């Protein structure tokens, strides 16, 4: 079964450099071209270069001017794809996709985030209901990098929750809100706790949300 | 390098219809064309290459055609599994180079928002802050006008939306437009309203506080 596996999440300042790993299994890895593709906002899919692990031959994108070394290891059939002199524009999906017409397998993806920012746990501030149904929530704020986790009553409540998508600030940090609907008969009698999680900076945090 | 251009960039579907989508390359790419679909938080799936055949295993109502710069992906009865966002992709030169892709939602009724707005917390505003939080709960379709008003005046670019993706169970989007601000600046403000257009209101509804009540 043809699998290929990535490395894991990484975070850069600008102009440092990033290494991805690429471990392909299943197949014969020196038979077929392996590429690199990212996938951002606002370019979208971006081809970044191919290597042919039989001989080491390897071609890029001549957008990356050069900031772009794929190579691999035909002994433990693993592909690396180093880019050098990161910049902010940099942050996206990175993924390996083997070829053959087309991408026909492609890895799990690597997070690559690049930012001047500083790793910061989120403060958690809570959206209360106030006045059949009520609205309430977390607001989960100012954090870097992503990503959070949030659950409700200990993952207890499911049921009508958002937890939408973080935004980037002006700061440099990220946001988002978390918010669920629940009967406003049940206010005066649940508890309704929301549960964050922002591993990068060892924060576990219990906000209960009342009502005022 | 070469553009692909896809259209249309979305479009909104029932199961059982038949689904057309058009992808024109800036140059010629011959037929060295393939199509994905990419689904929420995973890696793109081959589809189609060489314009018009299907890679292994794919089933036979998705078709691909086309030469030159004229591509098309069609699927000839939609099913549930085949909501997705679908990329083109030309490797004919290089650099290669992907269309911007073309989002496949679920059709359903129209349904009105419920809208609920939230102050900033007196916890926020102890740390300098002030965040105001207009929930827009279980719509559709996705088209949704929210405008901020301070003291009845319209507000631009100190707010941002976030939109979920299509409920699993009724198909309907959730957003969050958020207004940010200093403490200083929430301050010197007494209403806060966000006002909210969608086809499903006959007309706009506005949620709004007195800063303090
Ligand atoms: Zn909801
Ligand atoms: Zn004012």
């Known amino acids: 079964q043809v699998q290929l596996v990535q490395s894991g999440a990484e975070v850069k300042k600008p102009g440092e450099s990033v290494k991805v790993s690429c471990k392909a299994s299943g197949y014969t890895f020196t038979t077929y071209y392996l590429h690199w593709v990212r996938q951002a906002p606002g370019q979208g899919l971006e081809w970044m270069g191919w290597?042919?692990?039989?001989?080491?031959?390897?071609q890029y994108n001549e957008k990356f001017k050069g900031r772009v070394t794929i190579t691999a290891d035909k002994s433990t059939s693993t592909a690396y794809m180093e880019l050098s002199s990161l910049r902010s524009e940099d942050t996206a999906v990175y993924y390996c996709?083997?070829?053959?017409?087309?991408?026909?397998?492609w890895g799990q993806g690597t997070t690559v985030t690049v930012s001047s920012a500083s790793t910061k746990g989120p403060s958690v501030f809570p959206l209360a209901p106030s006045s059949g149904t009520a609205a309430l929530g977390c607001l989960v704020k100012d954090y870097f990098p992503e990503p959070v986790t949030v659950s409700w009553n200990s993952g207890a409540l499911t049921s009508g929750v958002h937890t939408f998508p973080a935004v980037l600030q002006s700061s440099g940090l990220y946001s988002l809100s978390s918010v669920v609907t629940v009967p406003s008969s049940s206010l005066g009698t649940q508890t309704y706790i929301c549960n964050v999680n922002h591993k990068p900076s060892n924060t576990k945090v219990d906000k209960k949300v009342e009502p005022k | 390098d070469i553009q692909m251009t896809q259209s249309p960039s979305s479009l909104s579907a029932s199961v059982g219809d038949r689904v057309t989508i058009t992808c024109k390359a800036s140059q010629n790419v011959g037929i060295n064309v393939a199509w994905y679909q990419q689904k929420p938080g995973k890696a793109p799936k081959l589809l189609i290459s060489s314009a018009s055949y299907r890679y292994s295993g794919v089933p036979s109502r998705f078709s691909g055609s086309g030469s030159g710069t004229d591509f098309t992906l069609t699927i000839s009865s939609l099913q549930p599994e085949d909501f997705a966002t679908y990329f083109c992709?030309?490797?004919?030169?290089?650099?290669?180079?992907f269309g911007q892709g073309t989002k496949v939602e679920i059709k359903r009724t129209v349904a009105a928002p419920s809208v609920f707005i939230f102050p900033p917390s007196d916890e926020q505003l102890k740390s300098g802050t002030a965040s105001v939080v207009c929930l827009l709960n279980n719509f559709y379709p996705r088209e949704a006008k929210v405008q901020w008003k301070v003291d009845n005046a319209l507000q631009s670019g100190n707010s941002q939306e976030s939109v979920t993706e299509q409920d699993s169970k009724d198909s309907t989007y959730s957003l969050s437009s958020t207004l940010t601000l200093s403490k200083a600046d929430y301050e010197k403000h007494k209403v806060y309203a966000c006002e909210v257009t969608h086809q499903g209101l006959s007309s706009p509804v506005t949620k709004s506080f007195n800063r303090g009540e």
């Open positions: 996709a083997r070829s053959w017409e087309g991408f026909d397998y």
């Open positions: 290597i042919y692990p039989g001989n080491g031959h390897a």
């Open positions: 992709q030309q490797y004919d030169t290089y650099p290669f180079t």
